[PDB]
Tab-separated table of N, CA, C and O in Angstrom:
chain	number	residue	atom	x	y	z
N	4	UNK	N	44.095	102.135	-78.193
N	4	UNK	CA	43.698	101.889	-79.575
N	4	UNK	C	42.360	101.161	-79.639
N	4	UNK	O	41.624	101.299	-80.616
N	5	UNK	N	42.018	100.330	-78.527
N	5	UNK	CA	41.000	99.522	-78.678
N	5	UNK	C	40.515	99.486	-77.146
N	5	UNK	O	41.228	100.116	-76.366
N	6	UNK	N	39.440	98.858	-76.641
N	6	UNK	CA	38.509	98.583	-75.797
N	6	UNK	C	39.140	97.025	-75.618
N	6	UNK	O	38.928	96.185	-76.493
N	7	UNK	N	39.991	96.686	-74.327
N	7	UNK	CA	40.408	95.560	-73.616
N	7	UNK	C	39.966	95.125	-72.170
N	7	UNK	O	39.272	95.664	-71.308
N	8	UNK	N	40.533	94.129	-72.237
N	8	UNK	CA	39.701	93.623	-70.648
N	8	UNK	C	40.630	93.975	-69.394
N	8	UNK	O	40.463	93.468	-68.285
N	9	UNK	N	41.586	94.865	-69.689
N	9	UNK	CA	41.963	95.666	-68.195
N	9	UNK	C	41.216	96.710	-68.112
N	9	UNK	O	41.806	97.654	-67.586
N	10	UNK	N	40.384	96.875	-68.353
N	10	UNK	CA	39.697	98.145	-68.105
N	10	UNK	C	38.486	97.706	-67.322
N	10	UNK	O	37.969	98.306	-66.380
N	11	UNK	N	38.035	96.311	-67.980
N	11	UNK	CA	36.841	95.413	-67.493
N	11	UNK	C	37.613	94.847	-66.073
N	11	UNK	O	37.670	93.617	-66.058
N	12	UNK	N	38.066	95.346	-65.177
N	12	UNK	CA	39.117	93.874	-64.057
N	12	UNK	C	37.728	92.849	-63.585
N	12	UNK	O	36.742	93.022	-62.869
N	13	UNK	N	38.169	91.919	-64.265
N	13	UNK	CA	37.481	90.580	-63.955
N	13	UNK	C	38.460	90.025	-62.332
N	13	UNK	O	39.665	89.863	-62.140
N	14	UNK	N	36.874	89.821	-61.139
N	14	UNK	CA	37.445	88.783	-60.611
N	14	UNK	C	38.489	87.761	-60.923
N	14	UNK	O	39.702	87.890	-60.758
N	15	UNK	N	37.569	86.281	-61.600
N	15	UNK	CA	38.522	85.484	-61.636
N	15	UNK	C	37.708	84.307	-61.533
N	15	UNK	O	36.536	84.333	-61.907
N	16	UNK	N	38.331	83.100	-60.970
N	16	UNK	CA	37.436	82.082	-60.603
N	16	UNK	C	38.260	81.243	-59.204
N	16	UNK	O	39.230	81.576	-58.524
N	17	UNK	N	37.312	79.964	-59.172
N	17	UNK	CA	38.334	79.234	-57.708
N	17	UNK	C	38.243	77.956	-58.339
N	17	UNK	O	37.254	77.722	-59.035
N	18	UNK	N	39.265	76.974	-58.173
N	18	UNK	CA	39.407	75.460	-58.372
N	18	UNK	C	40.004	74.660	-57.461
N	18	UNK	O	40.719	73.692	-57.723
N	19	UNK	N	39.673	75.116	-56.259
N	19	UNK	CA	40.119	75.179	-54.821
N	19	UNK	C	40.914	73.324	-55.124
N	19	UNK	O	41.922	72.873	-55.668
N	20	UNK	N	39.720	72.781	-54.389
N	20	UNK	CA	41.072	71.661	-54.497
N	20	UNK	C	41.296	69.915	-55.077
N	20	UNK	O	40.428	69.973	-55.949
N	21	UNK	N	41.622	69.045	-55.144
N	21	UNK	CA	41.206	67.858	-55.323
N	21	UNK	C	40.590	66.831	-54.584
N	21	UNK	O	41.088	66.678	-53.469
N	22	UNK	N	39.589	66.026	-54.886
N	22	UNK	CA	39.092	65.508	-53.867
N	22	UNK	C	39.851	63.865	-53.200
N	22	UNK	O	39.551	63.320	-52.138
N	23	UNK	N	41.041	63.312	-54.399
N	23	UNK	CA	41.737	62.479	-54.034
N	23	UNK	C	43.000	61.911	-54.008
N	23	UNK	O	43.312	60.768	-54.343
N	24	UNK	N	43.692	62.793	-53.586
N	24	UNK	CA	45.612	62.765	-53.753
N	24	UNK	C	46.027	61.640	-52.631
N	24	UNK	O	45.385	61.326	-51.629
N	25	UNK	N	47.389	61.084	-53.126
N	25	UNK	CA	47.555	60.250	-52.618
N	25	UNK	C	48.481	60.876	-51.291
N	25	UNK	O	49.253	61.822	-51.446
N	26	UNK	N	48.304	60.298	-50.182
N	26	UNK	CA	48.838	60.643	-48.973
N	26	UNK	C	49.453	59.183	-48.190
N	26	UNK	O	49.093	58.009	-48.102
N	27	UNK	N	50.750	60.146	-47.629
N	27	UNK	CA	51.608	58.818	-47.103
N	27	UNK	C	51.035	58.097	-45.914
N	27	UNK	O	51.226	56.902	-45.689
N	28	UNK	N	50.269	58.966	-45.117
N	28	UNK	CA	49.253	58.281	-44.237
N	28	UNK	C	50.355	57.314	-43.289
N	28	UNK	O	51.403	57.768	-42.829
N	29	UNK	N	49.805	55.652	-43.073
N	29	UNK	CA	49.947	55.140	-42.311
N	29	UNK	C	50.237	53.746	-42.869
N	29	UNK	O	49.314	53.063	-43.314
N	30	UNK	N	51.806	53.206	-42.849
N	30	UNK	CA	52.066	52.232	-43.446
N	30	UNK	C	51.726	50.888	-42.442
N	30	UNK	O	51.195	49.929	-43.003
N	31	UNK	N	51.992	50.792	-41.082
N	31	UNK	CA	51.873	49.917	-40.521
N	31	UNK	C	50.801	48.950	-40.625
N	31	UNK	O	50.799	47.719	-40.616
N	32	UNK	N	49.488	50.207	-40.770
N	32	UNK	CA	48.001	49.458	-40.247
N	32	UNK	C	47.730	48.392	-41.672
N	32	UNK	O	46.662	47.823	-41.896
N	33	UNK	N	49.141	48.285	-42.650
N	33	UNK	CA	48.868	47.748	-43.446
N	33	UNK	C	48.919	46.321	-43.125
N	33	UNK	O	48.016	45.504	-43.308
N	34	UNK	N	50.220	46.090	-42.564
N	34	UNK	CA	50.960	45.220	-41.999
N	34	UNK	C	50.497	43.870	-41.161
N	34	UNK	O	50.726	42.662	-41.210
N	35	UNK	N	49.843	44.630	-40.497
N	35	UNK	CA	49.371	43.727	-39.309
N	35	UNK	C	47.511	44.335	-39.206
N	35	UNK	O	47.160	45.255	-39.945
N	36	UNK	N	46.611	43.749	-38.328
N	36	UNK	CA	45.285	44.164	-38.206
N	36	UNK	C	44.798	45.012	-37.156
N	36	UNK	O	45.589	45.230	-36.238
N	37	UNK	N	43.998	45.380	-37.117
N	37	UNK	CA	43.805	46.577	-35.481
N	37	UNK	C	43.910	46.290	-34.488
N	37	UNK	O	44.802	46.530	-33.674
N	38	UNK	N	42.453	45.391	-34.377
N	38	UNK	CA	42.738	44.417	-33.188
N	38	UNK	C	42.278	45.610	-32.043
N	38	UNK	O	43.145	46.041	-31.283
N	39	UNK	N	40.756	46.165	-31.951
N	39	UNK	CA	40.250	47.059	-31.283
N	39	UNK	C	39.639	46.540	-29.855
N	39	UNK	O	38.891	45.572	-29.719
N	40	UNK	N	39.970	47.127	-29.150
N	40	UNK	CA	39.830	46.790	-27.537
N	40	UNK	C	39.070	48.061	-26.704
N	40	UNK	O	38.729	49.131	-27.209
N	41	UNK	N	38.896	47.638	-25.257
N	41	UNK	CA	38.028	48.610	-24.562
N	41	UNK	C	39.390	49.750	-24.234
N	41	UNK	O	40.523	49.805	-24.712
N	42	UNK	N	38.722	50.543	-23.259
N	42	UNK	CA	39.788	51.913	-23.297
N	42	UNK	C	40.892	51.169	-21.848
N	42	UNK	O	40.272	50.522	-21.004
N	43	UNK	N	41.577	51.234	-21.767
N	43	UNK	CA	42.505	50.662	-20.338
N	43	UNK	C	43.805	49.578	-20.695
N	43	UNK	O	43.564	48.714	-21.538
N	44	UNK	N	44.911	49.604	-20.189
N	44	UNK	CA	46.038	49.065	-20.615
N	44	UNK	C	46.009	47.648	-21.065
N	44	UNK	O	45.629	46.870	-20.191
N	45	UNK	N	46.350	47.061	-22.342
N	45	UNK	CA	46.218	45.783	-22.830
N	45	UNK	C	47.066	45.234	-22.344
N	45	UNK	O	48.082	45.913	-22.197
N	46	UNK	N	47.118	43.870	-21.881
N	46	UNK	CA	47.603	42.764	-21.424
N	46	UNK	C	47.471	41.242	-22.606
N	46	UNK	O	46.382	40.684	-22.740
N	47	UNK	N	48.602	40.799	-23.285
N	47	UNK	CA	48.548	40.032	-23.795
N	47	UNK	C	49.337	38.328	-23.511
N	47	UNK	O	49.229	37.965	-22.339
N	48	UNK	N	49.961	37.481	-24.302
N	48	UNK	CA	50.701	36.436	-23.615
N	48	UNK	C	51.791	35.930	-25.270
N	48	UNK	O	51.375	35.609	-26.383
N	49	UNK	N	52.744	36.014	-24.930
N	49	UNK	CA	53.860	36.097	-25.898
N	49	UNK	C	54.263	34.350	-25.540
N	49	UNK	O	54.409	33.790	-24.453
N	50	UNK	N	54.358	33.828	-26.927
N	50	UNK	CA	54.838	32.414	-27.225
N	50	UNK	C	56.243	32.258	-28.188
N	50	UNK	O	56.348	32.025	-29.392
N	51	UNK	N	57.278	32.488	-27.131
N	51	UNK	CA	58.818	32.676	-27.515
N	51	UNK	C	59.201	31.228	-27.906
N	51	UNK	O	58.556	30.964	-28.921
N	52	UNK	N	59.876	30.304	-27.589
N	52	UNK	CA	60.616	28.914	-27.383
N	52	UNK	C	60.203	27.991	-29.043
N	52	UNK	O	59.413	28.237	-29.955
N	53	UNK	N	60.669	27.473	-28.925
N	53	UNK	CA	60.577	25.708	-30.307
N	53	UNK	C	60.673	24.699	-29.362
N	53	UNK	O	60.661	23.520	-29.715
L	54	UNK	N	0.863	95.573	25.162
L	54	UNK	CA	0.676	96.878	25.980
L	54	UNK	C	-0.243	96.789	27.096
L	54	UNK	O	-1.178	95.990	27.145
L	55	UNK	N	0.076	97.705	28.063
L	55	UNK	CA	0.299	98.063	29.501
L	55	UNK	C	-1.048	99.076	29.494
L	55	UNK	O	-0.969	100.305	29.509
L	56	UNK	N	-2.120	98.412	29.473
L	56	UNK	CA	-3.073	99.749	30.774
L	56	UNK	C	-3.052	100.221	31.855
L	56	UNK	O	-2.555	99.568	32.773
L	57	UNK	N	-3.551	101.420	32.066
L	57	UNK	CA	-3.565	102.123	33.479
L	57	UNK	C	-4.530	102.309	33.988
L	57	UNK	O	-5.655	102.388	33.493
L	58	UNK	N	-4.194	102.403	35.071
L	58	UNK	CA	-5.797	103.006	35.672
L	58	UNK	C	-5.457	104.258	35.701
L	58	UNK	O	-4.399	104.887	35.693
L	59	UNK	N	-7.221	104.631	35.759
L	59	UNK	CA	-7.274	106.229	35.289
L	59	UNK	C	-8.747	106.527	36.143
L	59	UNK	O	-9.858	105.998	36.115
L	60	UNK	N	-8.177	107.596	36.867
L	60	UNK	CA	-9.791	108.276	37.486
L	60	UNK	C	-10.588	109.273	36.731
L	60	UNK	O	-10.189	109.816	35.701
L	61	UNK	N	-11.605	109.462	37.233
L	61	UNK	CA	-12.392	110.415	35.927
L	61	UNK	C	-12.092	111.547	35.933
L	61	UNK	O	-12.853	112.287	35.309
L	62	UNK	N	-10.700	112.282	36.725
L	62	UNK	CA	-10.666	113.284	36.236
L	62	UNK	C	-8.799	113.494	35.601
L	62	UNK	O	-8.271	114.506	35.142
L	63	UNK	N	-8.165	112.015	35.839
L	63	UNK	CA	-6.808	112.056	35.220
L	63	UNK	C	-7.297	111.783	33.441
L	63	UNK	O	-8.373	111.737	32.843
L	64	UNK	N	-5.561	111.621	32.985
L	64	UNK	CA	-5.721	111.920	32.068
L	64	UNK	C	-5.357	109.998	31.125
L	64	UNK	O	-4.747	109.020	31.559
L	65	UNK	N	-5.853	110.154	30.200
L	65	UNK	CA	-5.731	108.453	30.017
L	65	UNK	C	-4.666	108.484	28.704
L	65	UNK	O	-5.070	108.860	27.603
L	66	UNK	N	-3.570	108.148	28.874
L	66	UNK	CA	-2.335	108.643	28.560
L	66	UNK	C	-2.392	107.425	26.769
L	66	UNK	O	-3.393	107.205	26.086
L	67	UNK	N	-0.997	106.914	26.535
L	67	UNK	CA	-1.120	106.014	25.274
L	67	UNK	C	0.267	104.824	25.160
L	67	UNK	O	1.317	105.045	25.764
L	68	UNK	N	0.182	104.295	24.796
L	68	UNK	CA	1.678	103.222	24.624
L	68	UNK	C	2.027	103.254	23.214
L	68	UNK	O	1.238	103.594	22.332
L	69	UNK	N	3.610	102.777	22.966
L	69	UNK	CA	4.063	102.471	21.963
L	69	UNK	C	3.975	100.703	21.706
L	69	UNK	O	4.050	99.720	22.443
L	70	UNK	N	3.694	101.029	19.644
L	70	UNK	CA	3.858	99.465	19.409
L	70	UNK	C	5.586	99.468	18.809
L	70	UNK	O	6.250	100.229	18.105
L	71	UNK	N	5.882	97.949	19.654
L	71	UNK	CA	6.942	97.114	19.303
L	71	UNK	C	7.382	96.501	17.850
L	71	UNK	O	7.447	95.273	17.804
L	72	UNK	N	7.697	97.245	16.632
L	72	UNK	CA	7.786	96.180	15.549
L	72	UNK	C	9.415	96.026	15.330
L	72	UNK	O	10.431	96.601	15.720
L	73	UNK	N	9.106	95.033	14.568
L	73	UNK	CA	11.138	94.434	14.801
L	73	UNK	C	10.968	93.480	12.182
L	73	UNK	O	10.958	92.334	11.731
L	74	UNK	N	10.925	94.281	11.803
L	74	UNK	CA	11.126	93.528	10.740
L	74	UNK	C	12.415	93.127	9.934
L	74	UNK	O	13.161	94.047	9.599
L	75	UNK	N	12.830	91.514	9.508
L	75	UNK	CA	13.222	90.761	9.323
L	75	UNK	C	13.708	90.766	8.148
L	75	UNK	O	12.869	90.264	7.401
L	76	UNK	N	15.172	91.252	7.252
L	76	UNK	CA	15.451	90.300	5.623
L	76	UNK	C	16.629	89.707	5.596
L	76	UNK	O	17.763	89.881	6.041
L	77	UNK	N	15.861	88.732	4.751
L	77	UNK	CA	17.311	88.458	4.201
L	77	UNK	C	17.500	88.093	2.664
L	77	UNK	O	16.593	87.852	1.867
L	78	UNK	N	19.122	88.104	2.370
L	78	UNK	CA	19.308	88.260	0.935
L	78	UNK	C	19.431	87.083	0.283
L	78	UNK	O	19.951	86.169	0.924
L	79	UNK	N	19.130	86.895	-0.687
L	79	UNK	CA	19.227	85.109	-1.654
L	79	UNK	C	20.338	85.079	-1.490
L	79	UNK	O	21.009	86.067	-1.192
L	80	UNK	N	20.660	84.233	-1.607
L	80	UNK	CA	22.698	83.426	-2.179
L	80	UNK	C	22.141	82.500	-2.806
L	80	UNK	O	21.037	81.982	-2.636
L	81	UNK	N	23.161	82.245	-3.748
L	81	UNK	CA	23.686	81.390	-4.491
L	81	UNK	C	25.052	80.880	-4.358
L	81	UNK	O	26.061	81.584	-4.343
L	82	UNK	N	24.998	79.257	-4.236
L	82	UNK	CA	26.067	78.423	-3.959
L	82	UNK	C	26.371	77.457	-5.069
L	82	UNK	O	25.326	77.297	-5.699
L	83	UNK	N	27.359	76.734	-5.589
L	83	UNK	CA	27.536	76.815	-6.389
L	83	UNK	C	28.876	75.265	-6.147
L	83	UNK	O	29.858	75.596	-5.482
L	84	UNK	N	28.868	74.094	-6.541
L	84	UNK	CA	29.960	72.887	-6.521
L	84	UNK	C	30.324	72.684	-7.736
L	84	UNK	O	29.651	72.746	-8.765
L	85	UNK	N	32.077	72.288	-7.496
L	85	UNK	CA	32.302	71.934	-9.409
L	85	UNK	C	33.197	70.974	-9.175
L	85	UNK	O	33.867	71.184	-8.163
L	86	UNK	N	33.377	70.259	-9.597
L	86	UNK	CA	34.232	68.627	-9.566
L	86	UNK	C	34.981	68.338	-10.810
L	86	UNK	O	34.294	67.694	-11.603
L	87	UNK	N	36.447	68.673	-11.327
L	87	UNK	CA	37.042	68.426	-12.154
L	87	UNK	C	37.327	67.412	-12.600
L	87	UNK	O	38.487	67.102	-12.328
L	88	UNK	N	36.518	66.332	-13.499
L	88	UNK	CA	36.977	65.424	-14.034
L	88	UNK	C	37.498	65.111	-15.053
L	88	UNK	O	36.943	65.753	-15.945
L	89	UNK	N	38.543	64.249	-15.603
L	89	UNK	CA	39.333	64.213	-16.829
L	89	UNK	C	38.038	63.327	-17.825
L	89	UNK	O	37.013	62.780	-17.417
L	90	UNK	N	38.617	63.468	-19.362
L	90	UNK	CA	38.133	62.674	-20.140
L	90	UNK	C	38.777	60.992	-19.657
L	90	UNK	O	37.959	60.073	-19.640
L	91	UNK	N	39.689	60.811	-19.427
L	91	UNK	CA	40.195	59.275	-19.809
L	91	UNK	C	39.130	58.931	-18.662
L	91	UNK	O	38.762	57.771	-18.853
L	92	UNK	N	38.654	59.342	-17.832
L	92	UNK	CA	37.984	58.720	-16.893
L	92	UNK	C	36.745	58.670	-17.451
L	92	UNK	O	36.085	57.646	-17.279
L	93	UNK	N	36.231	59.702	-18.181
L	93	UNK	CA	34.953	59.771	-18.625
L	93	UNK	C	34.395	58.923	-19.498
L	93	UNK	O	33.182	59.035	-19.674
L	94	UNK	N	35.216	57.779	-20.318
L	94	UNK	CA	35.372	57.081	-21.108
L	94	UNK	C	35.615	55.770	-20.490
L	94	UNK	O	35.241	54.729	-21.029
L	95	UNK	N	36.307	55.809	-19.238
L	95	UNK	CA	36.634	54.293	-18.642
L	95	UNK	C	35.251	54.239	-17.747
L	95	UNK	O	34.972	53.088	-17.411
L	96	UNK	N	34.406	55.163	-17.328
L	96	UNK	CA	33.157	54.825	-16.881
L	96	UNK	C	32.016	54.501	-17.857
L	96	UNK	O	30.863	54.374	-17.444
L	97	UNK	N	32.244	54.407	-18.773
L	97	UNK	CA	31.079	54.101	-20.406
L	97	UNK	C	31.449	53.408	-20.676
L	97	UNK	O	30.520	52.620	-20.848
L	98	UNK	N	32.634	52.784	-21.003
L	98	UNK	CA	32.929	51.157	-21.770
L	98	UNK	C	33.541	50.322	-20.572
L	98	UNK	O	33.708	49.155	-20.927
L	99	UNK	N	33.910	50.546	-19.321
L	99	UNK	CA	34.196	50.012	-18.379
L	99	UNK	C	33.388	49.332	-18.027
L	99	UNK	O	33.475	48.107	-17.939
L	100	UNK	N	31.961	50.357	-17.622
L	100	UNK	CA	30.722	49.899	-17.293
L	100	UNK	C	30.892	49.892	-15.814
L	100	UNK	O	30.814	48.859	-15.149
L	101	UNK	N	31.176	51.316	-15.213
L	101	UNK	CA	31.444	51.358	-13.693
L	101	UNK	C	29.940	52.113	-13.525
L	101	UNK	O	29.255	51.296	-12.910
L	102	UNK	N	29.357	52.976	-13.725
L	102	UNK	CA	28.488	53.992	-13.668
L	102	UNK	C	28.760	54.552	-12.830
L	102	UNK	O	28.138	54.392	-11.780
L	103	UNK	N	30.096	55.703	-12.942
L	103	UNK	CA	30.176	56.497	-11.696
L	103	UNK	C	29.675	57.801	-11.509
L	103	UNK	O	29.492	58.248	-10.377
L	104	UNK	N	29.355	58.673	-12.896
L	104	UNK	CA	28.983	59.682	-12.575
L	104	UNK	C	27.206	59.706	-12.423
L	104	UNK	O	26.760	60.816	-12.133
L	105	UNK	N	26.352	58.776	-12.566
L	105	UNK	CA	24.977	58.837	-12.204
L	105	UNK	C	24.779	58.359	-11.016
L	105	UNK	O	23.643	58.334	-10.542
Protein backbone atom coordinates (compact mmCIF):
# COMPACT_ATOMS: atom_id res chain seq x y z
CA UNK A 1 0.00 0.00 0.00
CA UNK A 2 2.81 2.27 0.81
CA UNK A 3 6.70 2.65 0.50
CA UNK A 4 8.25 1.20 4.11
CA UNK A 5 11.53 0.67 5.53
CA UNK A 6 11.73 -3.18 4.86
CA UNK A 7 12.33 -2.63 1.60
CA UNK A 8 15.10 0.07 2.65
CA UNK A 9 17.05 -2.98 5.16
CA UNK A 10 18.90 -0.61 7.27
CA UNK A 11 22.08 -1.89 8.90
CA UNK A 12 21.59 -0.73 12.29
CA UNK A 13 23.92 0.74 14.78
CA UNK A 14 26.54 -0.51 17.77
CA UNK A 15 26.46 0.62 21.58
CA UNK A 16 29.00 -1.89 22.24
CA UNK A 17 29.71 -1.37 25.79
CA UNK A 18 30.01 0.52 29.18
CA UNK A 19 32.95 2.04 30.27
CA UNK A 20 32.23 1.48 34.18
CA UNK A 21 30.30 -1.50 35.79
CA UNK A 22 30.85 -2.55 38.95
CA UNK A 23 32.98 -5.79 39.29
CA UNK A 24 33.49 -8.12 42.25
CA UNK A 25 37.18 -7.99 41.65
CA UNK A 26 39.21 -8.40 44.78
CA UNK A 27 37.96 -8.06 48.32
CA UNK A 28 41.04 -8.77 50.32
CA UNK A 29 43.45 -6.06 48.88
CA UNK A 30 40.90 -4.07 50.74
CA UNK A 31 41.63 -5.41 53.98
CA UNK A 32 45.03 -5.33 54.59
CA UNK A 33 47.98 -3.31 52.28
CA UNK A 34 50.29 -4.86 49.50
CA UNK A 35 53.29 -4.65 50.94
CA UNK A 36 55.42 -5.09 47.46
CA UNK A 37 58.71 -6.94 47.57
CA UNK A 38 61.56 -8.18 45.17
CA UNK A 39 60.73 -11.47 43.13
CA UNK A 40 61.98 -14.65 45.59
CA UNK A 41 60.31 -16.32 48.67
CA UNK A 42 59.34 -13.83 51.60
CA UNK A 43 60.54 -14.45 54.94
CA UNK A 44 58.89 -12.62 57.74
CA UNK A 45 58.86 -12.82 61.93
CA UNK A 46 55.44 -13.52 63.69
CA UNK A 47 54.86 -11.96 67.37
CA UNK A 48 52.43 -14.66 69.04
CA UNK A 49 52.60 -14.52 73.20
CA UNK A 50 51.15 -11.48 75.94
CA UNK B 1 108.78 -31.40 -14.08
CA UNK B 2 111.48 -33.71 -15.23
CA UNK B 3 113.84 -32.79 -18.30
CA UNK B 4 115.62 -35.00 -20.56
CA UNK B 5 118.32 -35.10 -22.36
CA UNK B 6 117.93 -35.11 -25.91
CA UNK B 7 120.47 -35.47 -28.86
CA UNK B 8 120.03 -33.56 -32.02
CA UNK B 9 118.57 -36.07 -33.71
CA UNK B 10 116.03 -37.67 -30.81
CA UNK B 11 112.97 -36.49 -30.23
CA UNK B 12 112.28 -33.89 -27.23
CA UNK B 13 109.25 -35.46 -25.80
CA UNK B 14 106.69 -33.30 -22.98
CA UNK B 15 105.43 -33.77 -19.20
CA UNK B 16 102.23 -33.54 -17.45
CA UNK B 17 101.12 -30.68 -14.96
CA UNK B 18 100.03 -31.85 -11.43
CA UNK B 19 96.83 -29.82 -10.28
CA UNK B 20 94.92 -31.02 -7.16
CA UNK B 21 91.92 -28.22 -6.44
CA UNK B 22 90.42 -27.75 -3.04
CA UNK B 23 86.40 -26.90 -1.64
CA UNK B 24 84.77 -26.62 0.83
CA UNK B 25 81.14 -25.98 1.90
CA UNK B 26 79.98 -23.13 4.58
CA UNK B 27 78.16 -24.58 7.70
CA UNK B 28 76.34 -23.08 9.92
CA UNK B 29 76.30 -23.90 13.67
CA UNK B 30 74.01 -22.83 15.74
CA UNK B 31 73.68 -22.90 20.34
CA UNK B 32 70.38 -22.43 22.24
CA UNK B 33 70.12 -22.38 26.06
CA UNK B 34 66.60 -22.71 27.53
CA UNK B 35 65.95 -20.36 30.10
CA UNK B 36 62.79 -19.85 32.24
CA UNK B 37 61.20 -16.42 32.95
CA UNK B 38 61.29 -16.73 36.93
CA UNK B 39 64.96 -16.72 36.42
CA UNK B 40 64.91 -13.98 34.01
CA UNK B 41 63.43 -11.73 36.53
CA UNK B 42 65.49 -12.99 39.63
CA UNK B 43 68.61 -11.83 37.54
CA UNK B 44 67.10 -7.99 37.11
CA UNK B 45 65.83 -7.30 40.56
CA UNK B 46 68.17 -9.77 42.23
CA UNK B 47 70.93 -7.96 40.69
CA UNK B 48 73.02 -11.20 39.83
CA UNK B 49 73.91 -10.18 36.10
CA UNK B 50 73.90 -13.52 34.75
CA UNK B 51 72.96 -13.41 31.36
CA UNK B 52 75.63 -10.51 30.20
Amino acid sequence: DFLSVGKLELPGSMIGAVRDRAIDSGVLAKLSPEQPTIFGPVKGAVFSGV
Amino acid sequence: PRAKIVGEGEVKPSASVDVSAFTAQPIKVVTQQRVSDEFMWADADYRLGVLQ
